[model samples]
Target: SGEYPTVNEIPVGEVRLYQIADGVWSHIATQSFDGAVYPSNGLIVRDGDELLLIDTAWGAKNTAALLAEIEKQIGLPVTRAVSTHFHDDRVGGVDVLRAAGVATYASPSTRRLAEAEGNEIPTHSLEGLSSSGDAVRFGPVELFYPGAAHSTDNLVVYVPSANVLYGGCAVHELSSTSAGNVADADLAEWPTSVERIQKHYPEAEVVIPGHGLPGGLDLLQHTANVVKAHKN
Candidate 1:
């Protein structure tokens, strides 16, 4: 009754739920890393009676709140969860989702790195594609690894039906001048990774970065430019 594609920002402690696209929401949370506070983004995708979550909030507490909000809004439990990388913001809620009986998926590299970092492991592993840089489909969403950019295991999700691209930390918001956090970044390969994403989803109308507001194709090019500038 409000709008077909409306954005609702609901606060849940340090985390907030931002409905970026129709039936697509982002869980935005703030975390301090390396003496700087940075916003982290995760996704919530609604498909019929099921919900698909991409990443989690910062930790179990925020994730529990996120699920409560989802349950209230969608009236259905999250069926599956996908982690775009091994970062805490992306996979921190794995334990909560697992406890709720939700199946989780992650790239093999992500799983390995997460295990080494003492992070929760995903229930399912999407193999081969992470290294080969191929795309895998889960329901209507397409998971593509464009190579190492933000992190060695960062993967992007594309919803073909909605023409929305969940760029994760691999893509930066248009407003971001620097690469944000490059602690685990492949600086030299970042631009190429973004280029691959552009070529693959050239017509993507709604592009949701891992943090900040969602924009269009310009965000992807902007991220590439930021990486290029940082490398120089």
Candidate 2:
């Protein structure tokens, strides 16, 4: 519990909100997995009467807690949901939201892979994924894909108005000490992806990773260098 100092477990259906930036806030699970938890994180952006959620936690247990936090904090309808990549830890909470009538979004590749390979939970499919590389806007928040790096379906959500970059697993605050667990990494395209992020946010001051504490522009470059140096 002390490890997640900011995390608070509130019953089974309580939502905990943390303001990561001006308009961008994240709803993390306080009751983490004994071990089922992977590098999982989810986002909640207040947009008028609807809230936009990005990436559900690993399983129903964690996702259930996240949803509770969302309801407790926003008290609005969950208009949309998104996944950073196809990892089970990130998308495992899909079924919980779908049951609540929340529409899920992701890249075409993510949905295709989830459908073909089947996500951890078969019924919890990625419902409304787009290949057109569209932006999901939540009030002043807008999420766009710079380029896929961590996975072919990786999506890097950016809050243009707030100037924050949600780096997903592509970039972590902690420098890589080893060649990342990239069984499906496109190393050749990874740097290009980071470059795209740099070009997209030349003035960004904050970069939030799917795991680890939030960082800045320099972290992006460092991650790029690490991934570039990593080999199969």
Candidate 3:
């Protein structure tokens, strides 16, 4: 359903889940920004008897809540997670997942960035697995690194079975006026990075941005446009 049903159990910020399909959803975790609560988007897909999280909740507590909801509502525990980057929105709950005995993966760049900065380092490394053609696979979904855009280690997740692309923060929503930071080093490379996704996943039926409504290929173009506008 389109409505982001609230996760009432979570006490930290506003937590919600947007169902994408029968067994797939986007985890919406909120954080205080500019004195207001803002939502960040992540992916949750059913994998056999377990679940896979592409990017995690904005923080550890929210991620724990997300896991609890998955078990309580979906009746499945999240056994696997692949963080898109080293940011808090992606790897914020590595400790929680690790304590819960879940397998957490992040690319080498992400690990180094997070570890060097003392962020919540992911539990596993995706070494030597970079680029779309050589993307790492986890059952029905695959993780692709189309170089860098939003961040040097940003990764886009693709659900082959469902033809959905979880672009995370790499792809911007059409409604976004800004790409967060116009001065970011990677800001100049957004279009190129997103173009790669369009080339590889032209059949993507649903494209989920990091914080806005899901769309098709238009999201990619819109993201590029956002970046271009930010620069100009």
| TM, every model | 0.90, 0.79, 0.91
Off by over 4 Å in 2: 1-16, 30-37, 120-140
Q: Which residue ranges in model 3 land beyond 4 Å of their true spot?
A: 5-11, 33-36, 131-133, 181-185
| lDDT, candidate 1, 99-208, per-residue tens | 99889899889999999999888879987575636998886588999999999999999988778999999998887888977899999999899989999998899899
Residue 85 accuracy (lDDT) in model 2: 79
The superposed Cα distance between candidate 2 and the true structure at residue 94, in angstroms, equals: 1.0
- lDDT ranking from best to worst? 1, 3, 2
Candidate number with the higher TM-score (1 or 2): 1
Q: Residue-wise lDDT of candidate 3 within 92-148, one digit each (tens)? A: 888998899999998888999999877898888887556544577876688888877
**Which 10 residues in a row give candidate 3 its minimum summed lDDT?**
5-14
TM-score (C-alpha, index-matched) for candidate 2: 0.79
Q: Candidate 1 clash total?
A: 0
How far residue 230's Cα lies from its native spot in candidate 2, in Å, is 1.9
lDDT of each: 0.82, 0.66, 0.80
Name the lDDT value of residue 24 in candidate 3. 83
- What lDDT does model 2 reach? 0.66
Quote model 1's TM-score: 0.90
Q: What is the lDDT of residue 41 in candidate 1?
A: 78
